């Protein structure tokens, strides 16, 4: 099983989420494939409306430490497993510390959402590990800027699987993230401990998107 | 002209707002007042579609400080107008710092949303004000907790809005929040000085709120 998240980080207006949806490919998508979306938070029910049996899940960007109840601006694991079966948690533009990113593992997991971890190198790992969760590995020293791509090498990505995968040592998923684009995900399709990409820039062009998802 | 804040903060999965919807009761509404209803921020499309035709107006729970771009988890301003007329912005729950709420109110305003801005005391009002915006005096201290109400008394209350509009001393909207209730609502009303309220737990049933908005 292989997974394909696009991070649409906050980049989209609702005419671009819905013209999105039109221009996206779902004839990419076979058995063996998971594409996943995650829209900014107020796009999360427009998506998984028009999405809904394509095939294609939804995530949110983040989720609320916080239980049901009175938190002004904030947005509950609960009310998000309504909508997605994912959740982006720690993401590195988020700057939040390891107590609370486990924090919010804890609460995806209690309410039956998959959280798909973020991390900025191997290391990072052990302080997050526990059953049930999703593993991104995206160094922001190779985050696009202003979509121009700051990729790793192949060899890089090869050697911190590799080395991912002693701690993960269980068939847990992995992806990666980091200027994942046409270019150069052949290479990662080929990694073969590797599960899947996290793409962010690339996966506001719906024809590029989808010809990420066909590589594989 | 009065104005009747629903503030649901985290209580509502998606069936209690498709449920709240079809108990609110839109004969109520008239040329006097706006109701706003701010729900989580994953709920504005749904609500805005189903109750701005009935003459409801949106609002946000928070916007971000940050301006389009790569900011995993963050919801716009730029996103929020395109659904929302209104932002609550600053609510004692977020406990953000006066520089932050500063920030908040200019990414409104440069965007064309009306921010609603929560002060806890009637000092706050100097750090934040600026034409344009609408003010919101919540004291931590009477907010409701589990259903209990703390109101505040109508003598302090009153005594409260008095020194507000030593400052705000140009008609500038002011909203009142706090245990806000049917059994409280008649002394807010007759409060000339004061524009309507702000709800919470009472705001969570539909006809509970509609018959706050026809105390007016």
Same mark, same amino acid.
């Given at each position: 099983?292989?997974?394909?998240?696009?991070?649409?980080?906050?980049?989209?207006?609702?005419?671009?989420?819905?013209?999105?949806?039109?221009?996206?490919?779902?004839?990419?998508?076979?058995?063996?494939?998971?594409?996943?979306?995650?829209?900014?938070?107020?796009?999360?029910?427009?998506?998984?409306?028009?999405?809904?049996?394509?095939?294609?899940?939804? =995530?949110?960007? +983040?989720?609320?430490?916080?239980? #049901?109840?009175?938190?002004?601006? !904030?947005?509950?694991?609960?009310? /998000? &497993? @309504?909508?997605?079966?994912?959740?982006?948690?720690?993401?590195?533009?988020?700057?939040?510390?390891?107590?609370?990113?486990?924090?919010?593992?804890?609460?995806?997991?209690?309410?039956?959402?998959?959280?798909?971890?973020?991390?900025?190198?191997?290391?990072?790992?052990?302080?997050?590990?526990?059953?049930?969760?999703?593993? =991104?590995?995206? +160094?922001?020293?190779?985050?696009? #800027?202003?979509?121009?791509?700051? !990729?790793?090498?192949?060899?890089? /990505? &090869? @050697?911190?699987?590799?080395?991912?995968?002693?701690?993960?040592?269980?068939?847990?998923?992995?992806?990666?993230?980091?200027?994942?684009?046409?270019?150069?995900?052949?290479?990662?399709?080929?990694?073969?401990?590797?599960?899947?990409?996290?793409?962010?820039?690339?996966?506001?062009?719906?024809?590029?998107?989808?010809?990420?998802?066909?590589?594989?």
């Amino acid at each position: 099983m292989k997974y394909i998240v696009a991070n649409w980080k906050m980049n989209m207006s609702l005419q671009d989420v819905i013209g999105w949806t039109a221009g996206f490919d779902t004839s990419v998508l076979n058995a063996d494939i998971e594409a996943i979306v995650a829209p900014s938070s107020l796009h999360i029910f427009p998506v998984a409306e028009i999405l809904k049996k394509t095939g294609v899940s939804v =995530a949110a960007q +983040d989720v609320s430490v916080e239980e #049901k109840g009175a938190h002004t601006g !904030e947005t509950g694991a609960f009310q /998000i &497993k @309504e909508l997605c079966k994912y959740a982006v948690i720690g993401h590195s533009e988020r700057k939040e510390t390891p107590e609370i990113v486990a924090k919010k593992i804890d609460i995806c997991l209690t309410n039956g959402i998959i959280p798909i971890v973020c991390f900025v190198e191997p290391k990072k790992i052990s302080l997050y590990k526990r059953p049930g969760i999703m593993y =991104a590995w995206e +160094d922001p020293a190779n985050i696009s #800027k202003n979509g121009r791509y700051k !990729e790793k090498s192949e060899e890089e /990505i &090869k @050697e911190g699987v590799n080395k991912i995968r002693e701690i993960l040592d269980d068939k847990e998923p992995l992806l990666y993230g980091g200027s994942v684009n046409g270019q150069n995900i052949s290479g990662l399709v080929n990694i073969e401990k590797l599960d899947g990409v996290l793409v962010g820039h690339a996966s506001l062009d719906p024809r590029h998107f989808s010809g990420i998802i066909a590589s594989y």
